[PDB]
Design a binder for these strands. Sequence first.
DNA 1: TTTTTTTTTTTGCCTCGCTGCCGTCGCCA
DNA 2: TGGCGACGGCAGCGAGGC
Length: 382
Amino acid sequence: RAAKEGFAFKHDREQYQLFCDSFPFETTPDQAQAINAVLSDMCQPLAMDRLVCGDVGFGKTEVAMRAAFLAVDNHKQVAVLVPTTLLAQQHYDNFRDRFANWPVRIEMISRFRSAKEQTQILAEVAEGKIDILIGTHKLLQSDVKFKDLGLLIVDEEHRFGVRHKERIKAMRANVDILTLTATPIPRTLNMAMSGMRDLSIIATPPARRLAVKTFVREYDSMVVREAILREILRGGQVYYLYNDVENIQKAAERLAELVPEARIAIGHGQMRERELERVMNDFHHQRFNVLVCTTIIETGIDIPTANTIIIERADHFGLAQLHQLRGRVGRSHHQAYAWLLTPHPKAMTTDAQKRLEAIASLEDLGAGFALATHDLEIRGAG
DNA sequence: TTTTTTTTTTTGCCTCGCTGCCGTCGCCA
DNA sequence: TGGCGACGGCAGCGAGGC
């Protein structure tokens, strides 16, 4: 229940500081309070019931990863459910770069899950020496083996109902979890968790506060070309979204015709994992100045070199797509840009004008949706 | 109180769309 | 010649507004 007594989690502050001093970002007081609360809850023999909210942008995603020191010394396993493969690979790369100079062993599962990869995963879960695990779409239903589960983090529960939460709750044999949603969610679940899980809303906008230009205009090729010319001034990056059903090759050809001075790569979704890895390598090496991603299978996180985000399909929207894209924008120590095209919504044609007026008066997701979430959590929980 | 003021709105939601999976085929021993 | 891994299609998929 609420108590969920655990074991000894001695801090060893000197080694933690020696391992964490290499962080290339000055800690702000609110982040220091957050990490202090996290380490106090870890050392506390009670449940790992801490609620911390962070976005998908860099800086708000590896702050909770400092618990790796507390999860290695006790010699326990931890897991995280990365929804896609590119994000899983980026996370693995930065984790192994940050935690290189000590004998840690980390493996993960991706779209490369052939027979050899499955045998390797079976061997690693039979050994148990592996510290950190990263899952995929089919992680929940798969029989994942754990001998000593330290903690676990899982988010992005918008593309499906409440089934994975209870499935992972059925996997809580003498272990605790730190499940939290990065994207905003209705606060009824937060109120239900309240009274057992401590509420810690650090809410740090600063330490990366730069100018952000977000606008919206009518569909037009000239404005898109002007934005491309503005962003290619320092090797920036934009993203173009598509239904991934029609001729994405023709869309890319049209983009190349619009800007022949740039080099557009292949940003087609649902392709081979090898091609996805090549696309990630191209993004890391900045070989192609222009590269686009269409859906959640492709758009999972923002790139620090990226500076402009453009949305073209304002007539057909996705309930989960909007939530995913409302958390994947940011930049460090540079100006940020954003624009949106406004095609006329058409469908049953009964309320096309009403839909257009609503899009014009969108008011940033109904103005204060946080107020509505608070008003719902006050009224009820769960 | 029609589907929306996209919201103090309950169990209704239709809608094109994501996907685990099963069968089939090329390949290697 | 047989077993295997990659590939393609399809009906199920929590229970979810335009």
